[PDB]
């Protein structure tokens, strides 16, 4: 698409947002200062 | 005054009796039409002087169009069509031997990418180069 | 050489057709120039245009089709005509054979913003007159393509 709104996202960036937003959850459930992150 | 364009059309490996049933020869974009006889040859009648693109239209096997220049006097010639640089002449014998080039390719094959295609991802490289910069 | 074309205008409270002679168009076919010789508006015409402007009416122009074989006409919001200080442009469209096709009138600037206009402004006919012959469309460019592909091949 060319005129598509920028607010529409493909799979890769959605996965990136998912992986960005889950570190806090990891610390919440797994335990404090878990090693699953991205630095 | 009125002339006829003769020719033939054969598809390699397929008898005419199998494909001529639904094939038409078109002289200058449906402005003149003709039908191939049993043997595979074709004849188009009632053609005035000028230039005409002859194409054997057949859904089974495509045919290369050929330009034919017929004059008022009666002499007439065949050549390869070229809508760009139309002044050129590439002679082709008049009894058009438009052999087919096999069935056309209306369909497009599935992608079916393999792991070897996944190996060299431009996105992966372009996003791992900053990873190496961050490490160093 | 030169042909004179009548040009009538009309504007009424009821927005009907009351075309009246306004100006003569001198179309010189040789050099392709058109010149108009109009009379300035009068008080009643100015007044009539005022109510037409007040009621958001239309200002219609009409010329004979040939130098009484017909007419080609158009219209323009007279209130937009009066809110533009009587500044407009009329384009005369003809065909390839040199026959009148149409007349298009448009003010400058267009539209309206509720600008009150005094009477003294309407004593001049700021009119830009143009003639528009049919513009020949360009054909496909082949010479550039063949030469460019020749350079690519070599």
């Amino acid at each position: 698409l060319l005129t598509l709104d920028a607010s529409w996202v493909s799979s890769a960036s959605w996965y990136f947002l998912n992986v960005f937003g889950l570190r806090s959850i990891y610390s919440l459930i797994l335990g404090q200062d878990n090693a699953a992150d991205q630095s | 005054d009125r002339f006829k364009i003769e020719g033939r059309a054969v598809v390699p490996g397929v008898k005419p009796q199998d494909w001529i049933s639904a094939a038409r020869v078109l002289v200058d974009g449906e402005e003149h039409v003709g039908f191939l006889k049993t043997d595979g040859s074709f004849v188009v009648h009632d053609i005035p002087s000028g230039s005409y693109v002859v194409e054997v239209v057949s859904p089974a096997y495509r045919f290369d169009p050929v330009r034919v220049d017929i004059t008022s006097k009666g002499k007439m010639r065949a050549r390869y069509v070229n809508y760009i640089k139309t002044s050129e002449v590439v002679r082709l014998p008049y009894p058009l031997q438009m052999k087919s080039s096999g069935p056309p390719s209306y369909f497009i094959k599935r992608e079916s990418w393999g792991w070897t295609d996944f190996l060299m991802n431009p996105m992966v490289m372009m996003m791992v180069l900053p990873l190496l910069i961050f490490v160093l | 050489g030169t042909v004179g074309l009548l040009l009538e205008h009309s504007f009424e409270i009821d927005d009907s057709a009351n075309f009246r002679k306004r100006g003569s168009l001198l179309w010189n076919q040789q050099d392709g120039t058109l010149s108009l010789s109009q009379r300035q508006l009068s008080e009643e015409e100015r007044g009539r245009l005022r109510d037409v402007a007040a009621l958001n009416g239309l200002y219609r122009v009409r010329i004979p089709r040939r130098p009484a074989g017909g007419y080609v006409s158009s219209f323009v919001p007279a209130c937009s005509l009066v809110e533009s200080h009587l500044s407009d442009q009329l384009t005369l469209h003809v065909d390839v054979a040199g026959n009148v096709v149409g007349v298009s009138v448009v003010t400058h600037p267009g539209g309206c913003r509720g600008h009150e206009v005094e009477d003294v402004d309407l004593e001049l006919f700021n009119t830009s007159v143009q003639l528009q012959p049919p513009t020949t469309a360009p054909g496909p460019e082949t010479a550039a393509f063949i030469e460019r592909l020749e350079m690519e091949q070599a």
């Binding site: 698409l1 060319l2 005129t3 | 005419p16 009796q17 001529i20 049933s21 200058d28 449906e30 003149h32 039409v33 039908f35 191939l36 006889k37 049993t38 009648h45 009632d46 000028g50 230039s51 194409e55 239209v57 859904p59 760009i84 139309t86 056309p104 390719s105 209306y106 369909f107 497009i108 599935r110 | 927005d15 219609r60 017909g70 080609v72 006409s73 158009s74 219209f75 323009v76 469209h93 065909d95 054979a97 096709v101 149409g102 298009s104 448009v106 003010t107 400058h108 267009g110 539209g111 528009q132 049919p134 513009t135 020949t136 469309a137 360009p138 496909p140 460019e141 082949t142 550039a144 393509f145």
Partner: protein, 867 residues
């Protein structure tokens, strides 16, 4: 493509109304050879009614079938008014020989025999007769019949005698007959007789028994006869002696037979005395006898099983003219004796109303018990083919709707749908329990429902035969059929969707606007577009001829879109034209403008809409017909949207498109047809103020021109006579870098003439139909559905046809990713939306937005119809 054939698409092959048919074939051959009014020669499967080999021809009259004959296994046809004669092999499905003929209007075609076998063809034109060989089509001999400059020849006869009978007449005067010999062709004999009462020979006269000429004379209520073998003077026999009479204001006919050309005709023959009346007469040496009289019988037919002749007679079960119920029975009568056959009666019923059978061709064979078993192909009045088989089960074998060959207009109709907070919570929780129960419980036009994606619509099709169809857009089946009585072939139609299916309390409603060309009177038919039945809302009677119609987006209370018509007196008629409707459109009157394009005078007029339902001359332009005739008035589709108002030009800047919603694209041709002086003009006349935005004229070009008008751009394909090549020319309308009037667009408030970008491309093939791909929101890229004569549907991307493609790539172009300008447009076979489903003689391409945003529904209509 993607090799998912048949998953979503469907094609139906339709031939036109069956002008000439041939049923005589081997019982195992199971073939019908039919030539239709659509210039199509096809073979139909006898068992199921399907195409075996179909050969379409030129759409114009220059390939019209004029006469068909069958011999053995190859069918012989004449086309172009006797100019070409061809022999088609019915088995293979191809030609056997194609021969051009000389000038002269063809009048009669026949075969000849030497002694026992037919081997040559006698074809007669108004001034000459010609013989052609069966084996190769080589011309045998041509003879100019004497005195033919005055006489008009009407029939040709020959048989095993090795001679040729030629007959000509002069209206209300004497007639002449010539005897030729098949061996040479010289005039063996020539006679003349006086027929003062005779009008014409083919329609009225006939020839039975041993070449005995029989002209029915209604002046004296008699049967003038001439024993043409020996008699030189006509003889007369009144029908009163045979207890027969002719009708009033009707031309009686005589139907002979000839089982094979070599043998003489059967003595018995039919006589059409009066409509719904026939007689069987057996001529025997100067006298005739009535074999059987068939009253109140519509159609009769003859057949031969090899030795005996069989007559099929058609009549309804009980007459009520017309017929009680469309139940027609066909009975077999022996021709040797006028006796009805036993256990051969067939009975069928026509589904439509107001339609009566028109053509009947029967094919006979010997049953196991030597009983004559026959089948009947009957074409109704509304261009419908029925195949009837003798056995009671499935009295119709294959019903073919050939009428759909010529579709005028079609539309796609969506399928029908499948204060206190405490009350709100109560109903919401109740709904929750209802849904839970429905989920836990999980442990055809009757049930028609809209799809989830709205991808399955229903097509309402209009056919110039005056027939309305409802075809499921997914499977291609027909859901409802309706007929409009008394619809002329040249009538102009207009179909409008007044109310869709999104108003469940209200029935869906569509309006079709037909206009007879000859009379000029137009009528409105309102029907449910889902079920097909006429709505009970009586449409208004359009007394005056109308000129144009508008579908205003304003809707009535029942969500019916207001429709406006402009009559001949330039008045406006509304529909439903209620008080609310009248008030709404009277209050919104000055914002409604009509434009009428009189192509005959080359005039364009634009009218206002007054408060009191009257029109006034707002603007008027005249393109002189003496140098230019208007050929296309393509305006932009009203039901489209534009997503990006402007476009990114790179540079971090934007270029604004010239979105004028009232922009006509009138395309006119040059009345000068010379190959060197022809031109095609395109004017971007405004629809409201009448201003010509652009007045381009391409020189040295000729039609036909296929133009698509879209959101902003227009693309018109044309022929280039100078270079002999189809060429495109894309016109894109662009505003300045900043928009003039944003909030809203008014055609009266555009003093800035939009800039035009032009580019001419070369198309390496012809064209038959074009239409841009349309999406709901216009987000999806635009594609042109190029209709090639071959039948394919090229999907050309609009981004390719950009006029801004530079001739030399630059950094700006690379930033904008503009391809360098290439005058050649490819026709890559991979772009076709159809693989081999070619649509022969393509007429139009309809594109529907459908649901979603990436899928556009496509219906290519022409001879075949494909979706």
């Amino acid at each position: 493509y993607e090799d998912q054939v048949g998953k979503f698409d469907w094609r139906q092959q339709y031939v036109g109304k069956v002008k000439f048919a041939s049923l005589e074939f081997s019982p195992g051959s199971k073939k019908l050879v039919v030539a239709t009014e659509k210039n199509v020669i096809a073979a139909l499967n006898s068992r199921t009614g399907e195409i075996l080999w179909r050969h379409v021809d030129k759409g114009t009259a220059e390939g019209a079938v004029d006469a068909m004959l069958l011999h053995g296994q190859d069918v012989i046809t004449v086309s172009n008014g006797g100019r070409i004669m061809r022999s088609w092999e019915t088995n293979i499905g191809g030609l056997n020989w194609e021969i051009t003929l000389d000038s002269g209007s063809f009048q009669a075609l026949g075969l000849v025999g030497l002694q026992e076998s037919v081997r040559y063809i006698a074809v007669l034109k108004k001034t000459t007769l010609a013989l052609h060989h069966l084996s190769s089509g080589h011309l045998k001999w041509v003879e100019h019949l004497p005195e033919s400059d005055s006489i008009h020849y009407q029939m040709v006869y020959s048989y095993g005698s090795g001679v040729v009978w030629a007959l000509g007449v002069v209206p209300f005067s004497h007639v002449n007959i010539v005897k030729f010999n098949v061996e040479d062709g010289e005039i063996v004999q020539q006679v003349r007789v006086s027929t003062p009462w005779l009008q014409h020979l083919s329609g009225a006269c006939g020839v039975v028994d041993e070449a005995v000429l029989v002209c029915p004379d209604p002046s004296s209520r008699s049967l003038q006869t001439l024993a043409l073998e020996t008699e030189w003077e006509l003889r007369q026999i009144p029908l009163q002696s045979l207890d027969l009479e002719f009708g009033s204001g009707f031309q009686p006919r005589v139907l002979p037979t000839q089982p094979n050309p070599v043998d003489a005709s059967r003595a018995q023959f039919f006589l059409h005395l009066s409509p719904s009346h026939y007689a069987l007469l057996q001529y025997h040496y100067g006298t005739l006898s009535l074999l059987k009289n068939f009253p109140q019988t519509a159609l009769v037919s003859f057949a031969t099983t090899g030795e005996k002749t069989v007559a099929a007679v058609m009549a309804c079960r009980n007459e009520v003219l017309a017929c009680f119920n469309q139940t027609y029975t066909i009975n077999l009568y022996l021709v040797e004796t006028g006796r009805r056959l036993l256990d051969t009666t067939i009975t069928f019923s026509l589904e439509q109303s107001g339609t009566r059978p028109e053509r009947l061709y029967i094919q006979v064979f010997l049953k196991k018990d030597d009983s004559v078993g026959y089948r009947a192909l009957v074409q109704t009045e509304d261009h419908l083919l029925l195949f009837l088989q003798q056995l009671a089960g499935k009295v119709v074998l294959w019903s073919r709707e050939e009428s759909l060959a010529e579709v005028v207009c079609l539309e796609m109709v969506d399928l029908p749908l499948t204060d206190g907070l405490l009350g709100m919570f109560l109903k919401r929780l109740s709904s929750q329990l209802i849904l839970l129960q429905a989920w836990t419980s999980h442990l055809n036009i009757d049930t028609l429902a809209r799809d989830e994606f709205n991808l399955q619509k229903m097509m309402v099709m209009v056919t110039a035969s005056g027939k309305l169809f409802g075809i499921e857009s997914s499977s291609g089946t027909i859901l409802w059929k309706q007929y409009l009585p008394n619809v002329k072939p040249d009538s102009s139609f207009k179909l409008m969707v007044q109310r869709t299916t999104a108003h469940f309390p209200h029935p869906p409603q569509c309006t079709l606007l037909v206009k007879d060309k000859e009379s000029g009177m137009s009528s409105l038919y309102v029907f449910n577009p889902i079920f097909g039945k006429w709505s009970q809302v009586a449409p208004p009677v359009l007394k005056r001829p109308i000129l144009q119609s508008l579908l205003l987006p304003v809707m009535d209370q029942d969500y019916a879109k207001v429709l406006l018509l402009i009559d001949d007196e330039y008045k406006v008629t509304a529909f439903p034209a209620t008080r609310n409707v009248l008030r709404q459109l009277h209050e919104l009157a000055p914002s409604i403008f009509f434009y009428l394009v009189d192509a005959e005078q080359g005039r364009l007029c634009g009218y206002r809409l007054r408060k009191d339902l009257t029109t006034e001359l707002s603007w008027e332009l005249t393109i002189p017909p003496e140098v230019q005739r208007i050929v296309k008035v393509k305006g932009k589709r009203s039901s489209e949207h534009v997503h990006s108002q402007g476009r990114v030009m790179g540079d971090r800047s934007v270029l604004y498109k010239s979105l004028n919603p009232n922009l006509l694209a009138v395309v006119t041709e040059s009345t000068d047809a010379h190959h060197e002086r022809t031109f095609i003009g395109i004017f971007l006349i405004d629809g409201v103020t009448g201003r010509i935005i652009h007045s381009s004229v391409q020189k040295k070009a000729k039609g036909p021109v296929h133009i698509v008008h879209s959101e902003n751009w227009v693309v018109y394909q044309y022929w280039n006579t100078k270079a002999r090549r189809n060429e495109f020319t894309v016109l894109e309308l662009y505003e300045g870098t900043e928009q003039y009037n944003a909030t809203a667009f008014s055609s009266l408030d555009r003093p800035q003439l939009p800039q035009v970008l032009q580019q001419s491309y070369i198309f390496p093939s012809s064209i038959s139909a074009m239409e841009a791909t349309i999406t709901e929101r216009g987000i999806t890229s635009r594609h042109l559905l190029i209709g090639l004569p071959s039948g394919a549907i090229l999907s050309l991307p609009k981004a390719l046809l950009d006029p801004r493609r530079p001739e030399i790539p630059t950094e700006q172009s690379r930033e904008e990713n503009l391809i360098p300008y290439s005058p050649d447009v490819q026709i890559h076979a991979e772009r076709f939306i159809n693989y081999n489903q070619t649509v022969s003689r393509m007429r139009g391409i309809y594109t529907a937005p459908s649901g979603l945003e990436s899928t556009c529904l496509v219906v290519a209509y022409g001879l075949d119809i494909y979706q």
